[PDB]
Amino acid sequence: SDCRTYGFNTQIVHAGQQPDPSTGALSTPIFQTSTFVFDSAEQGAARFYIYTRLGNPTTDALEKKLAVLERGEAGLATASGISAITTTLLTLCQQGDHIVSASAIYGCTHAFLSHSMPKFGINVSFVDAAKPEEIRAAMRPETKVVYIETPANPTLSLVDIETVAGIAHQQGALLVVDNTFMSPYCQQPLQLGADIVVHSVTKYINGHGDVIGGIIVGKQEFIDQARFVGLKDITGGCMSPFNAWLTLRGVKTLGIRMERHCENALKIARFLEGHPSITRVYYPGLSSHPQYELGQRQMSLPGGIISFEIAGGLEAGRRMINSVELCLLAVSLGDTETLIQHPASMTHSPVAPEERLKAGITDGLIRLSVGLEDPEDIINDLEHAIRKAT
Amino acid sequence: SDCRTYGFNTQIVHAGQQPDPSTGALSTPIFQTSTFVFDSAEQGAARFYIYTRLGNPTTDALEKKLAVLERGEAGLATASGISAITTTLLTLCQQGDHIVSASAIYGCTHAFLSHSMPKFGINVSFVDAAKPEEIRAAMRPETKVVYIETPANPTLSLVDIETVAGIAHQQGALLVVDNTFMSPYCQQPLQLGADIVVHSVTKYINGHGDVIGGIIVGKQEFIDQARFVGLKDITGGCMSPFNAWLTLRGVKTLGIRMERHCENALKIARFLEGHPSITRVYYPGLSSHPQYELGQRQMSLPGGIISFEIAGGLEAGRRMINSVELCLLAVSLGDTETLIQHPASMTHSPVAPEERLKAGITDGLIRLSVGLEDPEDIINDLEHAIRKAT
Amino acid sequence: SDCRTYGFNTQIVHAGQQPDPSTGALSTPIFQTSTFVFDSAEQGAARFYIYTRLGNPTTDALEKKLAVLERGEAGLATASGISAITTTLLTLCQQGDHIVSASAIYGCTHAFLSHSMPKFGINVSFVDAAKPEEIRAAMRPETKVVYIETPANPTLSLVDIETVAGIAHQQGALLVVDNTFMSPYCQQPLQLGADIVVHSVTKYINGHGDVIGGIIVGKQEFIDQARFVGLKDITGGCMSPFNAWLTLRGVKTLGIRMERHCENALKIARFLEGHPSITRVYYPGLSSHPQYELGQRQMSLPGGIISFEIAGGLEAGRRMINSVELCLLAVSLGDTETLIQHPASMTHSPVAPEERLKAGITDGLIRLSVGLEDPEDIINDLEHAIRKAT
Amino acid sequence: SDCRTYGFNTQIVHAGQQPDPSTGALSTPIFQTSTFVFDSAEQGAARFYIYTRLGNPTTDALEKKLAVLERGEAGLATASGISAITTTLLTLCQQGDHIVSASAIYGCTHAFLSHSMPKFGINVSFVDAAKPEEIRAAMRPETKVVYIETPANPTLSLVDIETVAGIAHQQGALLVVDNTFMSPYCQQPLQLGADIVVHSVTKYINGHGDVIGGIIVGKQEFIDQARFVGLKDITGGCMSPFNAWLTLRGVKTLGIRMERHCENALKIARFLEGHPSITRVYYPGLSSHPQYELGQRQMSLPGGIISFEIAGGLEAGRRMINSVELCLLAVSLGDTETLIQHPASMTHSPVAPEERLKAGITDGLIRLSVGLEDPEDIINDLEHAIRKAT
Ligand SMILES: *Cc1c(COP(=O)(O)O)cnc(C)c1O
Ligand SMILES: *Cc1c(COP(=O)(O)O)cnc(C)c1O
Ligand SMILES: *Cc1c(COP(=O)(O)O)cnc(C)c1O
Ligand SMILES: *Cc1c(COP(=O)(O)O)cnc(C)c1O
DSSP states (O other): OOGGGGGGHHHHHTTTTOOOTTTBBOOOOOOOOOOBBBBHHHHHHHHHOOOOOTTOOHHHHHHHHOOOOOOOOOOEEEESSSHHHHHHHHHHTTTTOOOEESSSHHHHHHHIIIIIITTTTTTTEEOTTTSHHHHHHHOOTTTTEEESSSBBBBTTTTOOHHHHOOOHHHHHHHEEHHHHTTTTTTOOGGGGOOOOEETTTTTTTTTTOOOOEEEEEOOHHHHIIIIIIIIIIIIIIOOOHHHHHHHHHHTTHHHHHHHHHHHHHHHHHHHHOOOOOOOOEETSTTTTSSSSSHHHHHSOOOOSEEEEEEETTTHHHHHHTTOOOSSSOOOOOSSSSEEETTTTTTEEEEOOOHHHHHHHHOTEEEEEEEESHHHHHHHHHHHHHHHHHO | OOOGGGGGGHHHHHTTTTOOOTTOBOOOBBOSSSBOOSHHHHHHHHHHBBBOOOOHHHHHHHHHHHHHHHHOOOEEEEEEHHHHHHHHHHHOOTTTOOOEESOOOOOOHIIIIIHHHTTTOOEEEEEEESSSHHHHOOTTTTTTEEEEEESTTTBBBOOOHHHHHHHHHHHEEEEEEOOOTTTTTTTOGGGTTEEEEEEEEETTTTTTTTEEEEEEEEHHHHHHHHHIIIIOOOOOOOOOOOHHHHHHHHHTHHHHHHHOOOOOOOHHHHHHHHOOTTEEEEESSSSSSSTHHHHHHHSSSOSSEEEETTTHHHHHHHHHHOOOOOSSOOOOSSSSSSSETTTTTTTTTOOHHHHHTTOOOOEEEEEEOOOOEEEEHHHEEEEHHHHOOO | OOOSSSHHHHHHHHTTTOOTTTTTTTSBOOOSBBBBBOOOOOOOHHHOOBTTTTTOOOHHHHHHHHHHHHHHHHHEESSSSSHHHHHHHHHHOOOOOOOEEESSHHHHHHHHIIIIIHHHOOOOEOOOSSSHHHHHHHHHHHEEEEESSSSSSTTOOOOOOHHHHHHHHTTTEEEEEEEETTTTOOOOOGGTTEEEEEEEETTTOOOSSSOOOOOEEEEEHHHHIIEEEEEEEEIIOOOOOHHHHHHHHHHTTTHHHHHHHHHHHHHHHHHHTTTTTEEEEEOOTSTHHHTTHHHHHHSSSOOEEEEETTTTTHHHHHHHTTTTSSSSEOOOOSSSSSSOOOOOTTTTTSSOOHHHHHHHHOOOOEEOOOOSOOOOHHHHHEEEEEEHHH | GGGGGGGGHHEEETTTOOOTTTTTBSSOOOOOOOOBBBBBBBOOOTOOOOOOTTTOHHHHHHHHHHHHTTTTTEEEEEESSHHHOOOOOHHHHTTTEEEESSSSHHHHHIIIIIIHHHHTTTTEEEEEESHHHHHHOOOOEEEEEEEEEBBBTTTTOOOOOOOOOHHHHHTOOOOOOOOOTTTTTOOOOGGOOOEEEEETTTTTTTOOOOOOEEEEOOHHHHHIIIIIIIIIIIIOOOOOHHHHHHHHHTTTTHHHHHHHHHHHHHHHHHHTOOTTEEEEETTTTSSSSHHHHHHHHHHHSSOOOEEETTTTHHHHHHHTTTTTTSSSSOSSSSSSOOOEEEEETTTTTTSSSSHHHTTTOOTTTEEEEEOOOOOOHHHHHHHEEEEHHH
């Protein structure tokens, strides 16, 4: 049979994997090796597995699974989400090329695009990707890539993938989408015209807060270049077989995890929207979200991340996060535990307040990654902390 | 006490490591986490461990140990040896800069320098680094780095680190040395004036054929840039904590392994030099090596790698590797098992024979990574195969 | 706060665990050590962690979590489910003691009780535990333990835990319940009067088909004896820290997994009950189950295991399992993949047919462990295979 | 070829292992699975791998390697050294049987034999096994097993394996030898007439202080019973595949480790014997050892463990261990780090002083497990601490 014909939950469990033919072992073995042996001089030349830096059976299973889930031809695992992004863009671009990027992107990605790319002669124009006309207006004869993230932090704004793909393609560029926030269970950019999808598997795909890693999915021709040039000759961004095996294990529960994350998040978002100490709640599942209908067409679920603004600015946000007893203070997302952060007092404390404001980070903004706990316990913890903070 | 005051074997065992203060666990715990939690808003801002992509306690132990062993200030672990090299060079260089590199370098490194760097506007001049005058003559006002490997494949030629460091420094450049072949047990480039040392830990440092990884050692100021810019904003070349833990475990036996590798290799090299079917033997421990005295000053042991040429060219080399029963056919080195390869029929089969010849790869050249088996068994296997092949 | 006060899903995620105080690492570190160090002679005497055979911080987290989930005082992890059972019974019993056991128990447990115990002078009487009067009638002055499993293979019959606990206690014996089939998410024997619960974590608790292990939960006084005598001085049945860490990771999703297993199983059970080629379907969620109302009081969900009888006996059962394309042929249960077996042709093939019949294993009986795939795909596979087999 | 024909170092590296046929992976894959799948009903019956509790390809490699190294037919891996011992003895013995055991045995083994065995109707007579006549005099018609350890703590006394084997066999009993202290590199009890060898792999065989585990080696007929009855139906003492893989990795360096341990230990023993503050030194490599010549015939090296008595009794021993700066205070042995303990103040502090004295534990006795550090550093640390303590 062919895994690409089964339902999505069946694919989550089985795609890319099968019992070991030699032993019958059901779990994918951990091929924690650096060296592969040849039977003869002739077999060594013909292969020219050889070396985990080229490929590995455990990692291959993960790559094939994620390719099935994103409806792409091929996958390539990497050492980190950032390595997935930079291996992709450094494979595609050289000195003199140009990229149009969303401004509302992950912080580390922004640093790569704003400082590292221009030092290699690759220029980047940042635009508001919620306005597809700004993408069009920034495209140049040298533009190779349009780069977007959706939903995007810190207010969970959206980008219309299908519309942007059509613009990029008419002007001769590829569209790369960072799909980390959604996972393939909730959004499928390649089905909407994107050429390449990248993820930090560190978040939902692994889901267990114990793996740093990335994945790239796209056409075989591109993935072959990302592997044999990008990984081999540029970043050296290999995923270890053990991390691939842990990610395979974590992704087995992706469907049931995303369903529970999103069911919990919708309940919490509605609680916050009814709370008179909370000025704003940013969540694609609330009908007041400015791009609500686009989200309903593009995403199968509204996600597990919420942002919200607490009354009273910086000191209220600090008092709030210092008053939670169950939510844990951390900067990651997509884990089984609920995580909370207050950027203005945590990650962006040395940034000038007016510079945070232009970046959409108000003094009272809190970001919540909703976990698998009972939502009543999460709501009770938030209610306890909000009441204290105000 | 201070680990930097003890003998080298003591440092191999103990440097960078101590019993866990919280539990007393002797083994370094495997901190297989992506997320680190803060106790309050204030602690989260002060730290701005946070995230394994920034650092991790297991990986920190490995970095500190290797810094002690190379007599450097700081270490930085990476996803692969190639990532150690490219994270280093992409941190140091930008569009318009220049590198002088040895020509006799690892194949993948050559591909990065010959094809990837120039596409980022970084030019590279390749020279014969056994001739320090060629390094001097190639240096330009824009030269930021001189890059060398010693010993170098395929004939185990050497580079005079101290002399080259003095030339590089007089002309305002840094010297980067790939010390993979030797390990810090046998050669210490920083003590001879190199600025930065890189290794593929995939070889001797781990030693067990089950980890792909790299390490960078140098001054704190540079390592901080390689970590917070190179890894964070360019390659995303993180080492996983489990790979760091395996490398810590493998390096515990580095001293006893290198002693046995080199004792075995010297016996095998002398056997091959006495064999009338073997035209040449390349090994720094043989007094006929063209740079023998330099090797005796620069290396504490002559290493575990041998190359040799079998009579009868391509078909004899193929028959030989097809006739071994104990040596395993593979392209890695530094494992506990003896590994053998015949480049002209394996890795370089589609390369034009006259192009292999200019690269020092003759049709009869065999490379041997000597393992920890009884040398009598290795010699008997080689003798059996050589006699058949001729 | 106290984890014992939160909801059950919150407890699944958080109980027994917290961020590492020394580093903030969110994931429980893998303390893969054999040795623990003391700061002084005095600290070494006071502790007399010391040695993973006594205890280990990773394994302690798992033990504490499972104790919370079963509402018991303490937990003890073991090398296998069988070791959990034998460490328990060999701690409790000595030469001259007696056990009353259900006859419908796991095969390996039956072998221990029928052959191993009597060779140590410990006698066992087997009874039909669906009939509590048979338990009472078999109790002797020497009876130390009543041992039950519920639901029990092969027809998923039940045992009334509360009623049996009252009988055992009136006659001075302890009740031990193997709760593997249900997990603490679906049944809590200690809340119904059982004294000790054992599990094979190999099944649902880990859930990922990659760990062999057991756990014991009960009063602190008993668990201390099971640890310091049973494990230390009898079975030497330690769980490795890595297996404990994997089980901690697997149990994070126990609630969402059990919900999906049981939702899928109920759909499949109803499909089979409507199928004219299927003579019988054994599933606690079907109202025709002989102990249906007891199951509704004692179990929060009817479970993920189904047994059923296909028309046409031995050859139909063999043709059926040889015709599935998605279900995998295996003898375990509780994995994320759907597993199927036909005992009469697989595990019990050399047993006399009339001896299988008395054991409740008819020639046409199939056992199904329902996984996390789309139930429509599982049903389509079963329908395809049943139609072929008949 | 056949691994049993090669030299011992070659066997250490290669025995039981080969490149994976399906992939060529050189490292033995980690088959971290609980479940094995069958291709058809017929293959499932024929096998009746099936289940890691029966066997596993990773663990099988370790078992085969250790069988080669001990010159035995078959091996069986276990959860701990204690499980290797109890699985062996509980397989061999039943109610009414008798064991003659050395008195100078590992503490936990003594507890099993003195308290657990008699509660199962199995009687044990303890004798001074340095006097083979005491073994003979204690044998009864019911004696099934003679059990010995050599060298034996706390004074490293010896037992003449060959002489004791002949006595046991003439009287119809099996000889079981715990060979943990020596490893197969230094002593081979089966070659001297022992029937079964057990080890705690926790010590030298793994060697890296990060695995708890055991191994049993003997005839195929016995090992089959220890596996299919002892492990399956009594102790449930399975080794996890990951622990087996780590032990395979650790044992690769067994030969070079034992050579360095013993070279270091002999230097340290001679230093201590020349020290006027040290009243006695117990080490088989010193010619004053009471069984020196027996040790030279039976052991290829004198081992890595030393015991010694410091002048000044209990308080001097406590001051000494509180004054070391490099040696670590711990109760294990066979690790790469040097470990030290003072039983009278650490492990035996609540034992009556006259009861320790009869057990050979004087108030001033120190036990040292010599590691792989520079021996000059170990000697300097001991000298520093001894001078302070006196
Ligand atoms: C966390 C994240 C990344 C970075 O991935 P890493 O695995 O941390 O390198 C990139 N994009 C998004 C949207 C992320 O959330
Ligand atoms: C193997 C090797 C490398 C590459 O290291 P990887 O870990 O394979 O990326 C670089 N330099 C030398 C000298 C090597 O032998
Ligand atoms: C599988 C099972 C066991 C045995 O557990 P192991 O981990 O295989 O030793 C015991 N009881 C039940 C109900 C089981 O399903
Ligand atoms: C440590 C030891 C044991 C016990 O082994 P574990 O792996 O700790 O269960 C048994 N015998 C000897 C000689 C030992 O040193």
